[model samples]
Target chain A: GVFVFRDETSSSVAPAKLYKALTKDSDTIAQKIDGPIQSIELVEGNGGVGTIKKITANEGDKTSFVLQKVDAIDEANLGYDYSIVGGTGLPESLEKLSFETKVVAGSGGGSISKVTLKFHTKGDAPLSDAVRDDALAKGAGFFKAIEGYVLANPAEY
Target chain B: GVFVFRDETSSSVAPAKLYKALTKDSDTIAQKIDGPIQSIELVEGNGGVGTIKKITANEGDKTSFVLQKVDAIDEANLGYDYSIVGGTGLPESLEKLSFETKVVAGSGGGSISKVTLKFHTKGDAPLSDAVRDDALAKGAGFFKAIEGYVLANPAEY
Candidate 1:
């Protein structure tokens, strides 16, 4: 069973380009931009499913690192799914947190980036709505940074 | 069809550590070290097979870049294989070049790093043995840097 938290954001950039920035090349793109992230290190695996990437970022007042494992990647559909295997922010009872991102073309030239959040809870554990939007503020700035990069650097993948 | 050119080297470090430094974290580790590499940018994919990476490096008297794709990764055996999808140093009519590296334990605390080179040819293309060890000179400095990092860090994976 999976609990899905759905979130979407609009972008003026093309879905393919946005998808490339947000999904395929987020590790490199995010770190290059001036944002919360200091660096994204590939801890293990080559760059596919099962890859473990440790993101060293400034989350709020503290500098922290989060490790995420690639669960699924759909290049044809511009979909990416990854789970937080290590690092902080999970509820103590929770086993881990997962994320799914999909970028789709809009009717116009822009695109819509849809993201889903899933919480993998331990046995008989409770879920908290209070943990809502923890990364939204962080994500919004992150998106603007990515969007700016994608918009400015017209030649990059 | 493959043209195999094998090369081996000895290292004063353990296989696991050397493997981690050489294969797993070379993108992060190498750039951090004082070497010909300026930076390794993930051009596409997360870090797995089919993943494309663009490397900016100072080779000899010039600064150039090469693009590579991850071919295989045997994390269990400390083996990594990748191909030069698009880059310099390849002869005309040659399709591409590939590399496979395996790190195995030795009797001493050190390890032996074995690397295999493969030249992929286009239709009816010829092969030449004269094209050898393009990266070895660059690689030696690279290996020394990685070995130094692993030896100095002592606690990092």
Candidate 2:
């Protein structure tokens, strides 16, 4: 069995609102960021079962994952699977790439959104550590970006 | 500077078939996840610039936001802006919150997406480190969810 790294989860004010932003309004929501989001093409198919998106940024490039509606109840029991698929200037593909997100409404109109990202590597890749570290670091950035979006667009439910 | 904790930004992949399931295909996207999302509603708006959305995730619980599209030319240089109006079950009234998402074309047919979020809290209440940390955590989950969605719906894209 492969070791699964369960990342930390955060909670917010409105779980439902978070769900919509994460899955429903993902692309548009992302556009609220500071710089540019080149393109957010959603390959149509099922609904939340799964999907693919092409995202390009500063680091040169890499593909990420989006796991739609998963099973969950209560506060802590929510989450989904995700990871990186391929890249433009990188070598290996996303091996053990997966993660999860959840939300718990808090006081005020605030909600806590938790996200955990995992990177899977094959054998001894050159920048395995870099990949993991970069993901971890950028993982934080991603969260901040979302927060920014929410703050800027406070009227979202 | 005043800092008030605001909303959340979450991400997930809708089966390419179900891309925009909530708005474009609400009937189908509602099946995959747990319990009903309550008052999940999508209002009309634009994607290029000055986009707006009024969401009602569940009855009595609603929120809205005026969205501003940002640039993704570079992750570090990424940017976005937004402002919350008002909603049900909200703790604090949002003055304005914002964030950023950056994407880069990857090696394979994929692309790399990076994001960053910042908050300009308002009133007597301000955003704390713990709040920022939690938001960031959830943001990561959002990214992973989207990645998974894209992968599963590869045929759609």
Candidate 3:
């Protein structure tokens, strides 16, 4: 089965700044967040579409890893798409998981982020409700955290 | 820092029916979803607040386990809250993760599900964007899967 989740959030930070942070300053922002992500390393490419990045996260004494490959990146539109090809903590039945994010100018000088998530399950199995809800919450949380970081450090991005 | 994420979705199912499915027919619903959750078992209590449930999920050759404790359940309001106290797949920097869900009457003879998620960090670390996004996608995916199941099997709930 296929599942699509879409969401949008508005931020005072400029689309250019937020886009830059996502594309260029990812490592710095990753370090600022509190969760399990220890670091992100480039496995291939030069930070664009087709670039492969490896993310390592820790949970207690255990460490988990996921490999993400950029599918599309549009610097002018402030949008990108990526897929999680392999991961230690991902759902077992997951066949494909991809995300598309676009940042646009908002009404009041702020910026709005539009996100679309696509999921494909293995065989005839459908994605679970708990997992889907968890995915939405975490995705939104990540955007909010970045917004907070950019707002606090105005000169960073 | 504490983060709260809220979302709402409209469904064709009645609030009472949806609530019953969420409370009593959970295992049946859990079995319908295709992803990682292999099974959900009630470990203690009578499916109320303070009750504990264990979930097992499989990913490739690896298996993960998570324990959830029901913190609150209101039959009249069609709402509940639960916390993930222990889990093998959760981020290491996570101190606490809780979810509050409420089903209410919606327009056009349907129901609306409102969800609130709260996250706490282990120390000064902030939640990682990648991890957070994954969690949200999973959570939302789960809910949509359940909604689809109920909509298709109206006779069950």
Candidate 4:
């Protein structure tokens, strides 16, 4: 018998009163989580086109990813494409990840948004046992918090 | 006779915001502007009680400020007293220079916030004419920008 496991995802609800909470203060994403994030730094260039973030978790050490803001339909569609640039602890050194969120205006007059993230990782190191476990746990925690934040705040897109 | 102006004061919309805009990013009291601030690195104690920041502005200029957060009220009433413990540029030679700011909230539904700053310079030949003039100009610009920002974003506090 072989021990196989699936990846995890998490989300949180964020109130609409503060839109800049996620847009401008994107640097503080790890803080909103429940785990220990050693550091998070913004990559060169404006965040609009393609923004890269270097993250170091206590467990896996370091992971770098380029999150490209693909398109924003304003009050409609918000999309991003994330690709691993380098670093360790990831299932694969280089893989593509993507997320697209759509907010539908409610009949009464508010917006309900849904986000889906696609993940892919590939490499030869077999992904460290500790690193694989930590990444999956953190990913689940991340999406759950995001979902909670969105649900708590019903307004804003 | 040359017009030697020593005392400089100005009014602004949000005193707390203004003070944070100016000194929060300053490496030295009279040498750098907020826009030029690269990063503020904490080298000492906690943020509010006793803190220090290593501010690097321009291309090659680096300076540090050791600060002890003073007592204050709410957003309308906020300020801090700080001195340049050690740094390059003007701080290296100035015998005494202390920076302080105060903010007062206005009345009415659309009340105006006022920000006042005071600068005390001691000794002779420490602050050059050009540096002093530039500092004054930058201070004025900072407050003006704060007023404009508040006006533009009237609903936001």
Query: Could you say which candidate leads in DockQ?
Result: 2
lDDT of 4 by residue, A36-155 (tens): 344666665455546666666552232333333333324223323344445553444335444444433333333333445444446443433333333333443333333333333345
User: Mind giving the per-residue lDDT tens digits that candidate 2 earns over B20-135?
Assistant: 32123332333432221323333434432344544333322333323232222221332233333344422243344455544444343334444446555566665665556544
Let me know the TM-score candidate 2 reaches against the reference structure.
Answer: 0.42
Interface RMSD for candidate number 1?
21.2
Q: How far off is residue B23 in model 3, in Å?
A: 25
* TM-scores for the candidates: 0.46, 0.42, 0.51, 0.32
Give the per-residue lDDT of model 3 (tens digit) for A10-58.
6656789888776677666866544456788889987778898888866
Put the candidates in TM-score order, highest first: 3, 1, 2, 4
Evaluation by TM-score, superior candidate among 3 and 4? 3
Q: What's the lDDT for all of these models?
A: 0.68, 0.44, 0.71, 0.40
* lDDT of model 3, residue A35: 42
lDDT of 3 at A58: 63
Over A1-157, each residue of candidate 2 has an lDDT whose tens digit, in order, gives 1224444445453667566666556566565443224455556443354565555443223343332222223334445445545555232544445566666665545555566554556655444444554455455555545543553465675
Model 4 clashing-pair count: 19
Candidate 3's interface RMSD, please?
Answer: 16.6
Quote the RMSD, in angstroms, for model 1: 20.1
lDDT by residue for model 3 (B2-30), tens? 77778776665779987777666766666
Determine which window of 10 residues in candidate 4 chain B has minimal summed lDDT. B108-117
What ranges in model 4 sit over 4 Å off?
A1-157, B1-34, B59-76, B106-128, B142-156
